[PDB]
């Protein structure tokens, strides 16, 4: 019920379709704006800080090296209930169980390659926000 911000990643697989329009528009289209953004290349150190969280969980090597396969755009995205939007908008992590309509059932082929990040909740996205943008971007 409140203004929040969330960070959004257009992942690797994503920017190769060119399907970056489609999904700022999906978030533009549904009360949300990009207030932040920029295209990168992450290296591994990155994306390894960034993902520190799940430096134990299975699927850590396999997503480190798909994260940086290839440049990925990250925004910061600002609404009403932002954290939970995204998620609703982004749809299941595995595209087979994404309701129809979603992001990654509309652009993603594999959990593995699932078209994009959203934070998880109000805390992660204030870390993650923070590590992308120093605050006087904002």
Same mark, same amino acid.
């Given at each position: 019920h409140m203004k929040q911000r969330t960070l959004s990643?257009?992942?690797?697989?994503?920017?190769?379709?060119?399907? $970056?329009? &489609?999904?700022? +528009?999906?978030?533009?289209?549904?009360?949300?704006?990009?207030?932040?953004?920029?295209?990168?290349?992450?290296?591994?150190?990155?994306?390894?800080?960034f993902y520190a969280i799940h430096r134990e969980r299975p699927f850590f090597k396999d997503l480190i090296e798909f994260m940086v396969s290839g440049p990925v755009v990250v925004m910061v995205l600002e609404g009403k209930d932002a $954290?939970? &939007?995204?998620? +609703?908008?982004?749809?299941?992590?595995?595209?087979?169980?994404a309701q129809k309509g979603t992001i990654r059932a509309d652009f993603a082929e594999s959990i593995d390659a699932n078209a994009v990040h959203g934070s998880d909740?109000?805390?992660?996205?204030?870390?993650?926000?923070?590590?992308?943008?120093?605050?006087?971007?904002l």
């Amino acid at each position: 019920h409140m203004k929040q911000r969330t960070l959004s990643i257009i992942k690797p697989d994503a920017l190769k379709k060119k399907v $970056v329009g &489609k999904i700022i +528009d999906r978030f533009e289209s549904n009360g949300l704006e990009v207030i932040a953004m920029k295209r990168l290349h992450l290296s591994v150190k990155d994306a390894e800080n960034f993902y520190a969280i799940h430096r134990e969980r299975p699927f850590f090597k396999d997503l480190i090296e798909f994260m940086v396969s290839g440049p990925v755009v990250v925004m910061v995205l600002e609404g009403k209930d932002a $954290v939970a &939007k995204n998620r +609703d908008l982004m749809g299941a992590t595995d595209p087979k169980l994404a309701q129809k309509g979603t992001i990654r059932a509309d652009f993603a082929e594999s959990i593995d390659a699932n078209a994009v990040h959203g934070s998880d909740s109000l805390e992660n996205a204030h870390n993650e926000i923070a590590f992308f943008f120093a605050a006087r971007d904002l």
